[PDB]
Amino acid sequence: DIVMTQAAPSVPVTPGESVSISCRSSKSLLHSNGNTYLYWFLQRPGQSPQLLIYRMSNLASGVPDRFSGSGSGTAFTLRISRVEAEDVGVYYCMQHLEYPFTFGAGTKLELKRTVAAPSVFIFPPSDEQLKSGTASVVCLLNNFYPREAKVQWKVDNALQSGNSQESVTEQDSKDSTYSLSSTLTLSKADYEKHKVYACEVTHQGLSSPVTKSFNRGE
Amino acid sequence: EVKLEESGGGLVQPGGSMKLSCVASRFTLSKYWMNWVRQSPEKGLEWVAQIRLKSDNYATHYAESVKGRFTISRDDSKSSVYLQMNNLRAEDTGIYYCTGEIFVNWGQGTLVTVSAASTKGPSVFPLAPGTAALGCLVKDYFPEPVTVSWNSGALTSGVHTFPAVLQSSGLYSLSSVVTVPSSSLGTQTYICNVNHKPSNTKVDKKVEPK
Amino acid sequence: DGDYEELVLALRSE
Ligand SMILES: [Cl-]
Ligand SMILES: [Zn+2]
Ligand SMILES: [Zn+2]
Ligand SMILES: [Zn+2]
Ligand SMILES: [Zn+2]
Numbered sequence: 001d002i003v004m005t006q007a008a009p010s011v012p013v014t015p016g017e018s019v020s021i022s023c024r025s026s027k028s029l030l031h032s033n034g035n036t037y038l039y040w041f042l043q044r045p046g047q048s049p050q051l052l053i054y055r056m057s058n059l060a061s062g063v064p065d066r067f068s069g070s071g072s073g074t075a076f077t078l079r080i081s082r083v084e085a086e087d088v089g090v091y092y093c094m095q096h097l098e099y100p101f102t103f104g105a106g107t108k109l110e111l112k113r114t115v116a117a118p119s120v121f122i123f124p125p126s127d128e129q130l131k132s133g134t135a136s137v138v139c140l141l142n143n144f145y146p147r148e149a150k151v152q153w154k155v156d157n158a159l160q161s162g163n164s165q166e167s168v169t170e171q172d173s174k175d176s177t178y179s180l181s182s183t184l185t186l187s188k189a190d191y192e193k194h195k196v197y198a199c200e201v202t203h204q205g206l207s208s209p210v211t212k213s214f215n216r217g218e
Numbered sequence: 219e220v221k222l223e224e225s226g227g228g229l230v231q232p233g234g235s236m237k238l239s240c241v242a243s244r245f246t247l248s249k250y251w252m253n254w255v256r257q258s259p260e261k262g263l264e265w266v267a268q269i270r271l272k273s274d275n276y277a278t279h280y281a282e283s284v285k286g287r288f289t290i291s292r293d294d295s296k297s298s299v300y301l302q303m304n305n306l307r308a309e310d311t312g313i314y315y316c317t318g319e320i321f322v323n324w325g326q327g328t329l330v331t332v333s334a335a336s337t338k339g340p341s342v343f344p345l346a347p348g349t350a351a352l353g354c355l356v357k358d359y360f361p362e363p364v365t366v367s368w369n370s371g372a373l374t375s376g377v378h379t380f381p382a383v384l385q386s387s388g389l390y391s392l393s394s395v396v397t398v399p400s401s402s403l404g405t406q407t408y409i410c411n412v413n414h415k416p417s418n419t420k421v422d423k424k425v426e427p428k
Numbered sequence: 429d430g431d432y433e434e435l436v437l438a439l440r441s442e
Binding site: 039041048049050051054060061092094099100101102103104105106119121123124125126127128129132136138140142165166167168169179181183185 | 281315345380383
């Protein structure tokens with residue numbers, strides 16, 4: 001069917017600089033009409049998609065004039081002249097020349113900023129939780145940049161695998177940083193066997209990996 | 219301003235039925251073609267169905283993956299469009315939006331969860347501690363979503379409520395954390411306001427150091 | 429207003 005390809009899953013920009021987002025179709029989107037049947041959308045985090053461009057190069061009503069769209073039959077480009085914080089989200093192309101209407105996979109815009117070492121905290125499992133028969137050990141990585149962080153869990157300083165999960169916040173609108181949580185789930189009895197719980201963090205902002213730990217007793 | 223509003227979503231059994239509605243305000247629905255578009259992390263944005271006007275004999279077009287199971291309809295006098303979804307599959311799970319003819323107007327979307335798993339309310343545990351970090355762990359719930367706030371919305375300055383992670387056997391977990399000064403500990407009271415509407419669960423949990 | 433209607437009608441093709 002008409003396949004819409006957006007090669008870049010993500011693209012980084014320093015605020016106030018320009019960016020180009022590419023899209024390609026497996027067939028020409030040019031109608032005998034003389035118009036190219038392609039839409040561009042922005043989906044800001046936690047929001048519905050919003051139209052930016054119709055017929056490949058036309059600005060939709062109320063869209064800032066820093067946006068532009070161009071292309072030639074099968075290769076299309078969305079451009080932003082000067083990126084602002086309100087421009088972060090996922091950029092999608094869509095063709096409406098033929099049924100079914102198809103969308104590209106999306107390109108997310110990310111803001112570049114200076115390196116920020118994470119502020120690391122460790123949280124022991126609550127007493128209320130231990131009664132249930134399970135232990136959750138939480139490690140927070142606060143306001144850091146770039147996204148890449150290595151979180152190594154340690155139980156009696158032995159490396160851990162398979163018993164931990166991560167979740168990352170979207171880039172912060174205020175200062176362009178990320179925050180990350182890393183939870184370790186262990187059975188209460190397995191938790192009660194070992195003493196020292198450590199969270200080791202490697203990030204380019206740190207001169208050597210940072211360790212936040214605790215002893216189960218206290 | 220034009221407003222589209224979807225309703226009828228929720229948790230449903232595979233093989234079951236569900237009808238979604240979309241109501242238009244400040245929009246002469248009868249003059250425009252309407253569409254349903256869905257979204258999942260797996261498939262991204264997917265165009266589902268379209269309905270034309272009365273003078274187009276209400277012509278419909280559907281995505282192939284939905285053909286024979288979904289039916290799009292309109293009732294111009296009720297200012298509404300509908301999506302009747304039969305013999306629902308796990309792949310049909312996601313946020314369903316209705317839109318107008320030129321994709322300018324979209325509703326906020328309605329979440330459709332197709333699963334054989336039963337509803338389950340969460341457990342709220344505290345994450346007790348220059349700058350200090352305080353939190354609340356909202357563990358073991360189904361389906362999504364959960365809502366977390368701090369001091370009934372009075373303290374929003376340094377809050378970080380994390381995206382929900384799916385666990386080992388189809389149960390979600392979520393952490394909500396906050397940054398506050400060390401001088402404020404024991405002086406200012408910090409409370410996490412939790413709610414999980416599918417299971418009718420509401421928790422008000424205080425965060426105090428051990 | 430009729431601006432949205434004007435745009436829809438100009439863009440419509442069957
Ligand atoms: Cl529209
Ligand atoms: Zn602006
Ligand atoms: Zn923070
Ligand atoms: Zn017609
Ligand atoms: Zn005009």
